[PDB]
Every structure is written in C-alpha cells, then in structure tokens.
C-alpha cells in the first residue's frame, strides 16, 4: 500500500528522449574541429538579423547552400558567437539534429511517462495480451526527473550494423554515459511489488539478449564487430531498462513466449514486406559511434536503483 521509491537511472549506453524539434542543417548548428555544437537561441538571432542587412541575410541564408554550418559565420562577419544557449560535445562517423526534451526553462529532463512506458514494456513480458482496460498501471505512479545539467549531453551519430557499420545521416543529442537521473515511483502492493519489477526487468532483458540478439551476434561477428561485449552475466544486480532513444522494433514489441524463430521470421516479414527492401534474418541492430576510435555502444540501456522513501 503506497510504496514510494526513488528510481535512479544511470545511463550505461546513450539515452535520448523526444523533443518535438528537428534542428536543420543550418538552423542554429555549428560544428568544427574544436568538436562543439553550439545551439543558438531562436528568436534573438532573427531579431538581431533585423538590425543588419535583413533581406540580404535572408537571401544569404536561403541561397548559401550547400554549406551553412560554418561558411556564413566565417566569410560574412558573423564571426562573433555570443548567441549560444549552451555548448555540447559531438561525435562523427551529417545534419538534421534532433533535440532532447526540455521544459520552458530549457533544462533537459526525462518525462515520467517515458519511464512508465518503458516499465510497462518491462512488466508486460508475461501476459502479452494485457488488455486495454488494465488495472495495474492506474496505481503505478511515476514522476518527472530532476532537471539535469547541460553537461550530461553529447551529440551522437547513429550507426546500423549487418555486415559493415554503415553511417546514417541522423544526429541526436543523447545523454552521456554514467549520468545519474533521479525519479520517484509509487504503487500499491496489492498488484505489484519491487521484486516483481526486478524479476520482470530481468526476464525482459534476458529474453531480448537470448534468441534474437545473441543468436544474431554469433552470426556476422567481424573485424568491426568486436563496454559493449556482453554486459548481461557479470552482475545481474543493477538491472536494465531501455528508454526509447531509437532502441529498435525488438525493444518495443513484446510477443516473446514461446516464439524463438517464429518471432524472428514474423518480425522480418512484418518490418520488411511493408516498408523497404527484403533481406534475410536477422535484419540489423543499432549501436552508436564516437571517436581515436568508434566504441559501438547500444542505445537506451541503463541502470536501476530503488531505495525506499
């Protein structure tokens, strides 16, 4: 009855969440060999382009393509940069950057609904047909995170891997690894306990690793294949939830028991036949890239601590 906790999220891999913003190739982004990406605040830039060469700077900003990330703040006279919001480190190996969820004060935070949906996917490993009218999650109350600092962010570039680590032109400002994120979570003990959470989380992670991830890891292990080695059997303590920073289809879907290869072939047919080109099982996973050398960490995997009150 009303067991309040303190869920502490420690990001092992990169954590990215939501945002509703798609920052373009030229829109407020500058990266060079000093490896920072300043984001310029929104309306101050155009109200400062009000007071100097208005139509000229509008024409320059539309017709300086295919180059505006550094080109028009270096050969025009916009070399001064006081219009930043914050700096963030980057990761190569080109544009359309996505954005971490912020409040109106601009501090990043994790909404409690994302963690609740992640825990819902963790609990629904058993009873996959847990219906529209569920009664467990009217009592499982999750709350908002602490507004974490602006130095736990670093811009990553995602990579997908079947036979070579193919670069993709998607940039997302994720969280740094080993970032401590403080929540609070409450529920009634008639329907769920913390031990139920722990065995459900462990069941979800072991069913994700076995029979789709490790069975596709024993295949296609090459000189770019092998921090990131196993991370399951060392300590099962400090369990893992995935927060949806592009984790993939397998993390979101959950019809596991007892489908071992039926799951793989149905997933392949469902994803491939309706969207894009058709290949063999398995399709791919999604690590990240950060140089010098790319480290290949999996997105969303984190650590979980529960302490009472």
């Amino acid at each position: 009855m009303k067991k309040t906790y303190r869920v502490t999220l420690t990001a092992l891999g990169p954590i990215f969440i939501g945002g509703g913003e798609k920052l373009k190739k030229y829109e407020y982004i500058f990266d060079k060999q000093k490896k920072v990406a300043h984001m310029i605040d929104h309306t101050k830039f155009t109200k400062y382009l009000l007071e100097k060469n208005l139509l000229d700077d509008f024409t320059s900003r539309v017709n300086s393509h295919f180059d505006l990330y550094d080109y028009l703040v270096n050969k025009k006279g916009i070399v001064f940069m006081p219009l930043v919001k914050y700096s963030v480190p980057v990761a190569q190996f080109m544009n359309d950057l996505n954005t971490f969820v912020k409040d109106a004060f601009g501090r990043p935070y994790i909404p409690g609904s994302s963690l609740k949906g992640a825990l819902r996917t963790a609990i629904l490993n058993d009873l996959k047909e847990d219906t529209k009218e569920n009664e467990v999650f009217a009592h499982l109350q999750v709350s908002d995170s602490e507004t974490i600092d602006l130095e736990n962010l670093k811009v990553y570039q995602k990579v997908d891997y079947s036979k070579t680590a193919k670069p993709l032109p998607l940039y997302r400002e994720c969280l740094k690894p080993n970032t401590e994120i403080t929540f609070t979570v409450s529920f009634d003990d008639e329907y769920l306990t913390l031990k139920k959470i722990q065995n459900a989380l462990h069941k979800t992670y072991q069913h994700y690793y076995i029979k789709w991830l490790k069975g596709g890891k024993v295949g296609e292990t090459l000189i770019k294949g092998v921090t990131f080695a196993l991370d399951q059997p060392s300590q099962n303590q400090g369990e893992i939830i995935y927060i949806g920073g592009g984790a993939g289809f397998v993390s979101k879907t959950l019809h596991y028991k007892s489908k071992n290869r039926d799951q793989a072939r149905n997933d392949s047919f469902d994803i491939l036949k309706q969207l894009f080109r058709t290949t063999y099982s398995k399709m791919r996973s999604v690590p990240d890239n950060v140089p010098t050398g790319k480290h290949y960490l999996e997105m969303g995997k984190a650590r979980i601590k529960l302490e009472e009150l």
């Binding site: 929104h42 155009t46 109200k47 509008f58 900003r61």
Partner: protein, 125 residues
C-alpha cells in the same frame, strides 16, 4: 480581416478550391504528406504562442519567429520543386507577407486556420 482576399468566413473554401487545383494538374511521384506536415509543425508553435496572448498588437518575437518560418519554407522550396509549387500554387507566402503587413492577432489566426485547412483537405484527398 483581409489576409490576401481570404475572408474570415471562407478560408476553408479557399483551401478546398486551391487543393482541387493542386491534385488536378499534378507534377509528373506525387507530393508527400510529410513536408506539408512539417509546414504545419513550424506554424503551430507560434500558433500556440499567439492563442493565449492578451494584446491585439503582436510582439517583435512573434514576427521574428514568423520571419524564420519564411526562411525555413524558402529552404525547402529552394531544396525541392514540389514544395515551391505548393507555396506559389496555394498562396502561402503571400499570406505570410500579409500577416507581417497587418501584424494583428486575427490575421495570424486566420492564416493559421488557412494552413490548417490546407492540411485538412490534403488528408481529405
């Protein structure tokens, strides 16, 4: 309540006739429902800013955001030809210049309802 001949009580009819003039006489692959949706997701943030705003005369920051909407729609117009086809065929940038030429609240609300009606009749067809 001008908004480039678009009266307050006929914005839907203007958008409906404009998009019947879109899907008849098309260009060669068609227009995707994603780029018009990006136009809507650019206009709706300053729609959210203006919809709760008290005073009649708009602020500098609102028109500055509207200007960078012009810069952005010019960016996808210069990048893709079907986009500039949409901006000249459905009188969008004329409406935006009309918004920054009136700078009244109901002008931007009428303009937001017009681009809203554009995407509504794009879903209808």
């Amino acid at each position: 309540i001008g908004n480039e001949k678009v009266n307050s009580t006929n914005f839907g009819d203007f958008a409906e006739k404009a998009i019947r003039g879109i899907n008849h006489k098309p260009f060669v692959q068609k227009i995707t429902t994603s780029k018009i949706r990006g136009i809507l997701e650019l206009v709706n943030k300053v729609y959210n800013r203006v919809i709760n705003t008290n005073d009649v005369e708009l602020s500098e920051n609102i028109l500055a955001d509207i200007a960078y909407i012009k810069v952005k729609i010019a960016y996808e117009s210069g990048r893709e030809p079907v986009v500039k086809d949409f901006i000249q065929r459905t009188a969008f940038t004329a409406a935006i210049t009309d918004v920054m030429n009136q700078r009244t609240r109901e002008s931007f609300l009428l303009f937001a309802r017009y681009v809203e009606s554009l995407i509504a009749y794009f879903k209808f067809y």
